[PDB]
Design an enzyme around this catalytic site. Sequence first.
Site, PDB file in Angstrom:
ATOM      1  N   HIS A 125       0.822  -1.207   0.000  1.00  0.00           N
ATOM      2  CA  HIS A 125       0.000   0.000   0.000  1.00  0.00           C
ATOM      3  C   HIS A 125       0.858   1.260   0.000  1.00  0.00           C
ATOM      4  O   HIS A 125       0.596   2.202  -0.761  1.00  0.00           O
ATOM      5  CB  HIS A 125      -0.935  -0.024   1.207  1.00  0.00           C
ATOM      6  CG  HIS A 125      -1.330   1.332   1.698  1.00  0.00           C
ATOM      7  ND1 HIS A 125      -2.128   2.186   0.969  1.00  0.00           N
ATOM      8  CD2 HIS A 125      -1.033   1.982   2.847  1.00  0.00           C
ATOM      9  CE1 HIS A 125      -2.307   3.304   1.649  1.00  0.00           C
ATOM     10  NE2 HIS A 125      -1.651   3.206   2.792  1.00  0.00           N
ATOM     11  N   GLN A 126       1.893   1.287   0.844  1.00  0.00           N
ATOM     12  CA  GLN A 126       2.818   2.415   0.855  1.00  0.00           C
ATOM     13  C   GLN A 126       3.590   2.509  -0.456  1.00  0.00           C
ATOM     14  O   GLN A 126       3.884   3.609  -0.934  1.00  0.00           O
ATOM     15  CB  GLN A 126       3.782   2.287   2.034  1.00  0.00           C
ATOM     16  CG  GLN A 126       3.216   2.712   3.382  1.00  0.00           C
ATOM     17  CD  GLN A 126       3.870   1.978   4.546  1.00  0.00           C
ATOM     18  OE1 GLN A 126       3.375   0.951   5.009  1.00  0.00           O
ATOM     19  NE2 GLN A 126       5.003   2.495   5.009  1.00  0.00           N
TER      20      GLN A 126
END
Lengths: 298, 187
Positions: B29-30
């Site tokens: 996600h990051q």
Amino acid sequence: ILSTASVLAFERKLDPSDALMSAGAWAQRDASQEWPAVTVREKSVQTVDVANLPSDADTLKVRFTLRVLGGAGTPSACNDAAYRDKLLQTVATYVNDQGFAELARRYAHNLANARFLWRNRVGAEAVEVRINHIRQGEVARAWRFDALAIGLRDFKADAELDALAELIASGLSGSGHVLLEVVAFARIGDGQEVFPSQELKSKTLYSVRDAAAIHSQKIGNALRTIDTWYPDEDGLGPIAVEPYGSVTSQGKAYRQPKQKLDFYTLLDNWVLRDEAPAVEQQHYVIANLIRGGVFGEA
Amino acid sequence: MDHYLDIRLRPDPEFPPAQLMSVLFGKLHQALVAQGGDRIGVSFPDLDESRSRLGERLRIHASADDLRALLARPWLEGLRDHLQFGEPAVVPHPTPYRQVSRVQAKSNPERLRRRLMRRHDLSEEEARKRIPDTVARALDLPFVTLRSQSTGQHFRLFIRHGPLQVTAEEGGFTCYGLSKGGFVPWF
């Protein structure tokens, strides 16, 4: 007949300390002597204990000292004197054939990669471990590693890692007093969550004086992840050295006593009936003697 | 998106697989908020709908340049000892297509009560009268646990693999790789 003795008590060699965790900022890791501590605070969700870095801090300084004693075979309590002489001659035969050279290399690797950072390592982008051998109080020899280059699975030779292995080898042989200072810096993130040890308000976090910390036995368990000589399946790496070497988090018990690869039958075969196992299994039982414990029946 | 890359959790004596899956999903996600766009899709090939378990595998759905970029970018730093990898390759066919969507549930009555108090100027007792405790719904679906960086909360992110379909449709994906319209090959 040389039956085994009733009680055996092996003192803990490789004695670690409580891993105090403080925080700070990267690119000033050589100014890390007055860094503020990571306190444990309460936060209401129920009432839990959680610990974070401050909002201007992006690295975690976990610090502990490790004292290596030496005299690994000698028990501190035993009944049958003949068993004591046979065990002493067995460990003497082992160290005379080959000193603590593989075991010290694996302990130096487990110090090199920051496996004592348990959960604080897996999301880190960069870890650096500084090991200072302290004799007479100031320094004797300083080390500095990249703990992410040395993976957790493999054991790879090096120039400085073999020097550290020679130091720990000199310690475990009884040939020189060694006291290390192990400091680790880990880029976790600005204000991220750190994970100290967990005390038995359902959740309570361990702290020695208003500052979070890891238990000493957790660091001692992370240092003992050298066992690669079990019946290996599923692609599992090295596990912590244990009689009936088991993983509670996996719920699986490798080196079961149905096979002849546990600690106790191997030790009874090596000492009593003079059946020497392979070099890796005698490595494993000497690692169990280094770990310590109480062994013997009722 | 005809290319895929399988990632399987190595067994670890230190960790359970759910913890490793959650930190992997957070780092993915990051990596996607670092990358930008809506072209990155995820899946769970060894799913167990009955026991609500994600399995031990994760599979990314993208173009090949995205796979070779994400295979060396530092979002995989510190996990390459926890993870074994495949190679960026083309998917098999014929495959059914399904959606992977984040499902949210009204799990806390008091937060929606405070929202109703903020948006209708009622007191606490009018909020308890208008909203009871039966409203709270619990999902029987598998989930990852995620640490927010904007706010400081730790929340369970419940995932749903959608119905299998004979064809795929266009759309984007969120920064978690979940479907806001996109479809993935299911094999």
